[PDB]
Amino acid sequence: KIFKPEELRQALMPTLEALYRQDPESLPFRQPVDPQLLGIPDYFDIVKNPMDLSTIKRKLDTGQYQEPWQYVDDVWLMFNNAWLYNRKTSRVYKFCSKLAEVFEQEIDPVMQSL
Ligand SMILES: CNC(=O)N1CCc2c(c(N3CCCc4cc(-c5cnn(C)c5)c(C(F)F)cc43)nn2C2CCOCC2)C1
């Protein structure tokens, strides 16, 4: 079972676009967290493997995923980083839970199709 890069891009990119369409919830996820710019210099002490929407998009566009689960792993790494770093009462944390709900809804029919 081998997946062509364009097969993964066509199937999976719409699920990433579904996340981008969430406003305001996708806004903290669209670019790599910049700890110095944001004034949160502890970020990289807590989050060892950053991930965000732009990076996943680039990996999809440049054929970095060989299997659907590798893309799913990156989306979930993004979510887990956000729940790990941010407090449960914070915007980023609540927004992460919304994106996880949206992603779950969108990814399962795509997985059934792949
Ligand atoms: C997954 N992202 C993640 O873990 N981050 C770490 C914490 C963080 C992020 C942002 N950014 C990044 C830039 C864009 C952005 C936009 C919004 C936003 C939401 N709606 N609108 C209209 C704008 C929000 C907001 F949700 F907090 C946060 C952020 N700030 N911080 C805090 C906010 C309190 O000060 C200290 C820094 C990312």
85 pocket-lining for ligand 1 (C-beta < 6 Å): yes
Asked if residue 19 lies in contact with residue 103, where contact means CB atoms within 8 angstroms, the answer is yes
Instruction: Please state, in angstroms and rounded to a whole number, the distance separating the CA atoms of residues 79 and 81.
Output: 5
Domains of the chain: 1-114 (1.20.920.10)
82 pocket-lining for ligand 1 (C-beta < 6 Å): yes
CA-CA distances (angstroms) from residue 29 to 1, 42, 82? 32, 18, 9
Packing angle of the helix pair 91-113, 5-20 (nearest 10 deg): 150
Question: Which resolution, in Å, applies to this structure?
Answer: 1.4
Experiment type: X-ray
Number of H helices, E strands in the chain: 6, 0
53 pocket-lining for ligand 1 (C-beta < 6 Å): no
Judged by phi (left if over 0) then psi (alpha if -120 to 50, else beta), residue 82 lies in alpha
